[PDB]
Amino acid sequence: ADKTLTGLTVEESEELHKHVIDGTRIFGAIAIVAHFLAYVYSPWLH
Amino acid sequence: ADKTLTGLTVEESEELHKHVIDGTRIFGAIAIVAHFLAYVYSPWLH
Amino acid sequence: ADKTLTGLTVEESEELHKHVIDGTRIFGAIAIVAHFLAYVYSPWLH
Amino acid sequence: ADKTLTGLTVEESEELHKHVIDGTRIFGAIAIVAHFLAYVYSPWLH
Amino acid sequence: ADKTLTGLTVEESEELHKHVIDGTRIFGAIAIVAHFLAYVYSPWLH
Amino acid sequence: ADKTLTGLTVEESEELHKHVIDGTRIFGAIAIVAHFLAYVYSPWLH
Amino acid sequence: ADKTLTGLTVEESEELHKHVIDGTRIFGAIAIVAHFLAYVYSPWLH
Amino acid sequence: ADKTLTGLTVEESEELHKHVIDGTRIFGAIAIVAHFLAYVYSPWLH
Amino acid sequence: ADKTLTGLTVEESEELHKHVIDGTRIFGAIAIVAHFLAYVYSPWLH
Amino acid sequence: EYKGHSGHPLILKQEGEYKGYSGEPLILKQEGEYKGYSGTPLILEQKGEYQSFSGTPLILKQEGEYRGFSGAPLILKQDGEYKSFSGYPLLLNI
Amino acid sequence: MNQARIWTVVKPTVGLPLLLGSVTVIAILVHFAVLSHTTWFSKYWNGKAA
Amino acid sequence: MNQARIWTVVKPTVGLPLLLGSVTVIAILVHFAVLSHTTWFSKYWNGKAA
Amino acid sequence: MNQARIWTVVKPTVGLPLLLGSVTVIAILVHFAVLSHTTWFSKYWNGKAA
Amino acid sequence: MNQARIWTVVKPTVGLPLLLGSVTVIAILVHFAVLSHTTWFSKYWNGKAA
Amino acid sequence: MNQARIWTVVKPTVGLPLLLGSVTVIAILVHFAVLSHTTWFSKYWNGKAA
Amino acid sequence: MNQARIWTVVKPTVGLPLLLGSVTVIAILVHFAVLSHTTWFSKYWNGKAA
Amino acid sequence: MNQARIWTVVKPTVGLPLLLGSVTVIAILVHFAVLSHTTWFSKYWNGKAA
Amino acid sequence: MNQARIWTVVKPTVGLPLLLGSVTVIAILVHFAVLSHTTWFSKYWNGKAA
Amino acid sequence: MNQARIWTVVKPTVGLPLLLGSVTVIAILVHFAVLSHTTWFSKYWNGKAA
Ligand code: BCL
Ligand code: BCL
Ligand code: BCL
Ligand code: BCL
Ligand code: BCL
Ligand SMILES: CC(C)=CCC/C(C)=C/C=C/C(C)=C/C=C/C(C)=C/C=C/C=C(C)/C=C/C=C(C)/C=C/C=C(\C)CCCC(C)(C)O
Ligand SMILES: CC(C)=CCC/C(C)=C/C=C/C(C)=C/C=C/C(C)=C/C=C/C=C(C)/C=C/C=C(C)/C=C/C=C(\C)CCCC(C)(C)O
Ligand SMILES: CC(C)=CCC/C(C)=C/C=C/C(C)=C/C=C/C(C)=C/C=C/C=C(C)/C=C/C=C(C)/C=C/C=C(\C)CCCC(C)(C)O
Ligand SMILES: CC(C)=CCC/C(C)=C/C=C/C(C)=C/C=C/C(C)=C/C=C/C=C(C)/C=C/C=C(C)/C=C/C=C(\C)CCCC(C)(C)O
Ligand SMILES: CC(C)=CCC/C(C)=C/C=C/C(C)=C/C=C/C(C)=C/C=C/C=C(C)/C=C/C=C(C)/C=C/C=C(\C)CCCC(C)(C)O
Ligand SMILES: CC(C)=CCC/C(C)=C/C=C/C(C)=C/C=C/C(C)=C/C=C/C=C(C)/C=C/C=C(C)/C=C/C=C(\C)CCCC(C)(C)O
Ligand SMILES: CC(C)=CCC/C(C)=C/C=C/C(C)=C/C=C/C(C)=C/C=C/C=C(C)/C=C/C=C(C)/C=C/C=C(\C)CCCC(C)(C)O
């Protein structure tokens, strides 16, 4: 290997990004539920 | 084992996160009580 | 080649910019669809 | 024991935190007196 | 040659400025067209 | 003894604090007089 | 000669300032024209 | 004697503070005159 | 003579301050003129 | 290679002089001393004591030993220990 | 899912705090927007308006 | 609970102050929001309003 | 597509966060602008005005 | 009381000034909030209003 | 076109972000200025005002 | 008086300016608060109101 | 024209960006000032007010 | 006159500029305060109000 | 004229930018103050109001 600017290897950067992708998916799924609840109970889109 | 960017070992990072998780649970528990008190005394959700 | 101010080689800088260009094109593609939907549903340009 | 990220040993960190805990207790105690005085002289909770 | 304050040689600084001048000229051309459209459609200069 | 995080010895840190305590007491004394004059001349507490 | 706080020699400093003086004079000239145009077309000084 | 945290000796610091003290006395005397003038001409304290 | 905190010797600092003093005196002279012009043309002090 | 999703090329591939899009020249070289487009001269030399325009003196010299225009004393003596003005005890550490 | 090597060039101790902070600031701003520009969100908090 | 290794890439002296500070700022913002967009919260502090 | 070498002189850990951050800030500002100077955008959120 | 080791990972010259400063800022914000959203606090300072 | 040597004394990682950022900030400020000081710009966004 | 050792962990060049500065900011804020929420303070500065 | 040695004590990468930025800020401020405190500047942009 | 040793622990290039700057900021604030909460200060600048 | 040695303890690349910047900021503030608290300054820019 050779030094990246940050010092994370390509593999360590990919393992870090798995958490970032999974975090975005979890945030999205919760936000989808929050939008469904906001639709169900607010006058939005009614 | 290998050196990390922050200097903490994986074992030290997991120990630190236990305090973060415990603190988040304590904060959540107190927040739940505060919402219950607010619901009882304020006109919200009535 | 020679060392640069940021430490990235010319090849590394070019491979990085490919993500920036592709990201800009993806952002533009989504933004175009957003403008089309905005037009189809909002009173803008009507 | 080994060098910490901040340089303080476990004993020094614990001795430092004692002042933080005592300080929070002193602040809390004075705040309770201030709330009592406020309750007595202000129309709050009346 | 001698070490510059930024580390870029005079030759490298000139090639960088070529992109800055080109960028300014491109930005100016797009801006000119945008101003022409504003004149044609907005009540400005009417 | 060992080098503190700030480089000040215990004796130096305590001798510094003596100015902070004295300075706080002097500030308090002036502030008390300022409040007395405010009471005597303003409509506060009347 | 001797080292300077900025690492820029006296000759390089005087040559740098030439661009600053010329830039100020060019800014002043354009500004003078802008004020003349503003006077001719706006109600200012009328 | 030992190297201070700032590098100034006790003597150099005391000579520096003389300018701070004198500067404060100069500022204070000027401000006193400004208050006398503001009193004589403004409706304050009248 | 010894290395100062900033690196400027006593002679270099005194020479720099001459430009600061002359710069202030020039700013003052220009400001005095601007005040006279403002007085002659504005209703201030009239 | 970065495959992308938005078609190809993603970057331009030529080498040498930057063939900028907005005609040429892109810059003006200098063979030597900068000449102002606002003409000349640009600089006034310093060759000794700084020439004021605002008369002289420009500074008041101090002999490594200041004495103020508010006279004296400017500081209090301080030896053996700090002297408090607000009485004692002054610390109560453990 | 193709950007994974960004952490070879953006410091994680910078990009992750800025990512989580920015997402949170956006969420706060969207709440304050809907709160300022609807009647019903304020009304939901006011409830019976005791 | 699975993000425990974040402290190997994000400095604790940075993430922990930012986390505790952000939670505090969010709490303050929610209080000010409800305080401005409701009547009962202001009424609670005003009490008898004598 | 010809500026690809900009990353040899501008640090990626600086330019990329500033780029992604600015693009996000611009989008936020454009939303607030349209929200503050139009009626239909607020009307869309208010819906039935329940 | 179980967080005593936080000072081994958070610099005291950072966490302590931020802690003391945050507490003071919160106190100031609470005073300004009550002062703005209540009548009696302002009336207390006015007193006789002479 | 004669200032090309500026990058020998001003760091590209500083001057380039400040240049591109300032130009963008100015464009935003101009749009907000025209939007808040004219009637036709807001009317253009409202369109039919439905 | 028992906190005398805080300067062993908090840098004097940081804590001393931040202390004196914060104290001054509080004093400024208290003067502005009383000035904004009272009549007699403004009345004192107007005096004869000439 | 006699201050040419300022760059020997003030770093060019500091003073030059601050100079150009400050001049641009001053210009922006003067435009906003005249735009707010005059009628004709707004009228010029509004034109026929179509 | 007894604090003279503060410069042995507080960096002059930090505290001394911050002192002069703070004193100036305070003076500016006091002018703006009296200008906003009085009539005679504004009246003095208007003079004859020509 | 007796403070000439200030530059031995205050860095010129800090004190000189702060001095020139502060004096400029002060001038901007004084212009905005007189502009906001007078009629004739606005009238001068408005002229005939044509
Ligand atoms: C969803 C569709 C994909 C897409 C898929 C393709 C395909 C497929 C091809 C290219 C190819 C090209 N792409 Mg691409 N590309 C997109 C976005 C862009 C954008 C942009 C939005 O700014 C740009 C400037 C480019 C640039 C380019 C050129 C380098 C090249 C030749 C132009 C062409 O005919 O394209 C295709 C042109 C059009 C489809 C006409 C409209 C073009 C405009 C400028 C953008 C339309 C975006 C659209 C609204 C996104 C949503 C579409 C819906 C999914 C239906 N792409 C999006 C992300 N691109 C070519 C290539 O490199 O082949 C090897 C090619 O054949
Ligand atoms: C889009 C066209 C290109 C362009 C293409 C050319 C061409 C072609 C030539 C030059 C050449 C020159 N260019 Mg160029 N150049 C542009 C932008 C600029 C700008 C600027 C906008 O401020 C400047 C100052 C310059 C500077 C110069 C001089 C060094 C030189 C002589 C002037 C000239 O011929 O102008 C030409 C420009 C005009 C007379 C007016 C341009 C009007 C508009 C803005 C552009 C043309 C219409 C276009 C279809 C509109 C769409 C723009 C897109 C939205 C980007 N370029 C843009 C980005 N440039 C010459 C050269 O080097 O020859 C060897 C030359 O013949
Ligand atoms: C031409 C205007 C020049 C100027 C040119 C001179 C000259 C010439 C001399 C001095 C000398 C002196 N100057 Mg000088 N000086 C100016 C500004 C100043 C200011 C200030 C504005 O606060 C101060 C405090 C000083 C300080 C001093 C003393 C160190 C010294 C002795 C006083 C004396 O004899 O005064 C005499 C009277 C004055 C200096 C005039 C004071 C009135 C001010 C300047 C009026 C406003 C501006 C005026 C209308 C001119 C137009 C300015 C342009 C628009 C920029 N100068 C400006 C920058 N100065 C003298 C010296 O060294 O003696 C040994 C001397 O011979
Ligand atoms: C003259 C005003 C001086 C002062 C001069 C002295 C003197 C003289 C003595 C002390 C001593 C003491 N001072 Mg002291 N001190 C002042 C301000 C303070 C303040 C404060 C919040 O203002 C505090 C908490 C203290 C603390 C203390 C105690 C450690 C101690 C008394 C113990 C005791 O029996 O306690 C119970 C009694 C008290 C806590 C009362 C302490 C004094 C009060 C608070 C002073 C009020 C000042 C008044 C408002 C304004 C003065 C005018 C100008 C503003 C300067 N000082 C001011 C700056 N102090 C005494 C000691 O024990 O020394 C061995 C002693 O002899
Ligand atoms: C009409 C006049 C106005 C008014 C106008 C002003 C103005 C204007 C100002 C003040 C200022 C102050 N006012 Mg007042 N003030 C009013 C009425 C009040 C009321 C009230 C409930 O009515 C209170 C509580 C106060 C109290 C105070 C202080 C908070 C503050 C001076 C600080 C000081 O002395 O620091 C020095 C510190 C001390 C004296 C404490 C040390 C000595 C003590 C005795 C020792 C024990 C310390 C203790 C154990 C430590 C606690 C540890 C905790 C863990 C933190 N005023 C009235 C309504 N007041 C000033 C200010 O803001 O200063 C910052 C200010 O400028
Ligand atoms: C708001 C209201 C109502 C009222 C406010 C009123 C008010 C107070 C207004 C105040 C206004 C003021 C103060 C305006 C001041 C304006 C000024 C001063 C403008 C200056 C412009 C300077 C320029 C353009 C400099 C360009 C420099 C350049 C290009 C430098 C290039 C350097 C190079 C190439 C390096 C060479 C390296 C090597 C030597 C090795 O070759
Ligand atoms: C306010 C009003 C009314 C009006 C204001 C109007 C106004 C002015 C509007 C202006 C709008 C503007 C200007 C909009 C501009 C938008 C732009 C430019 C969008 C750009 C998007 C870019 C993206 C998405 C980049 C992604 C990069 C990525 C993901 C990079 C990934 C990098 C990696 C993986 C490292 C690889 C390392 C290796 C492996 C090579 O070593
Ligand atoms: C205002 C108005 C009206 C309108 C405005 C409208 C508008 C513009 C809205 C815009 C909204 C936007 C843009 C929203 C975007 C949202 C996004 C993108 C959310 C992303 C969430 C990401 C998460 C949750 C990441 C968690 C990462 C995690 C936990 C990472 C963990 C890492 C670890 C453990 C280290 C590993 C160490 C090792 C293994 C290597 O050793
Ligand atoms: C306020 C109101 C109402 C009204 C008044 C408002 C007001 C006053 C407005 C004033 C507006 C002004 C002043 C506008 C000025 C605009 C300007 C100047 C725009 C300039 C654009 C420049 C660009 C786009 C540069 C791109 C550079 C780039 C991409 C550089 C890339 C470099 C590379 C790849 C080389 C590195 C690799 C190696 C060579 C080493 O190999
Ligand atoms: C708020 C309301 C309504 C009202 C109240 C507002 C209020 C309170 C206002 C207060 C205002 C105040 C306080 C104003 C103060 C103004 C002053 C002090 C101005 C000073 C100007 C100084 C200048 C121009 C200096 C130029 C220096 C220069 C050019 C230096 C050059 C140096 C060089 C060449 C290096 C040489 C290196 C080597 C020696 C080695 O050769
Ligand atoms: C806004 C509304 C409506 C309501 C808000 C209400 C509200 C919340 C108010 C809160 C107010 C608060 C909290 C006020 C607190 C005030 C305090 C704590 C004041 C402290 C003053 C301290 C001083 C003066 C220290 C001087 C130190 C000094 C001079 C140190 C000198 C050091 C030296 C010489 C170095 C020696 C080195 C060597 C020994 C080696 O030689
Ligand atoms: C908002 C409302 C309504 C109300 C608000 C009310 C309110 C809170 C008001 C508060 C006001 C306050 C707090 C005011 C405080 C004012 C003070 C403290 C002024 C101090 C002035 C200090 C000066 C002038 C220092 C000059 C230093 C100098 C010249 C130093 C020179 C140094 C040298 C030569 C170094 C080389 C030397 C070597 C020996 C080494 O060679």
Numbering used by the authors:
A (entry chain B), B (entry chain D), C (entry chain R), D (entry chain F), E (entry chain P), F (entry chain H), ...: 2 to 47
J (entry chain S): 4 to 97
K (entry chain A), L (entry chain C), M (entry chain Q), N (entry chain E), O (entry chain O), P (entry chain G), ...: 1 to 50
Give sentences from the paper.
LH2 complexes are oligomers of a basic α/β-apoprotein dimer, each of which binds noncovalently three molecules of bacteriochlorophyll a (BChl a) and one or two molecules of carotenoids. Overall, the cryo-EM maps and the corresponding models of the four LH2 complexes are very similar, all with a ring-like structure in which nine α/β-heterodimers oligomerize to form a nonameric complex.
The protein–protein and protein–pigment interactions in the PucA-LH2 are very similar to other standard B800 to B850 LH2 complexes, except for the existence of the γ-polypeptide. Both α- and β-apoproteins in the PucA-LH2 have a single transmembrane helix. The pair of B850 BChls is coordinated by α-His-36 and β-His-40 through their central Mg2+ ions. The orientations of the bacteriochlorin rings are fixed by H bonds between the C-31 carbonyl group of α-B850 and α-Trp-45 (2.9 Å) and between the C-31 carbonyl group of β-B850 and α-Tyr-44 from the neighboring α + 1–apoprotein (2.8 Å). The average Mg2+ to Mg2+ distance between neighboring dimer subunits is 9.0 Å. The B850 pairs in PucA-LH2, PucB-LH2, and PucE-LH2 from Rps. palustris have H-bond patterns similar to that in the LH2 from Rbl. acidophilus 10050.
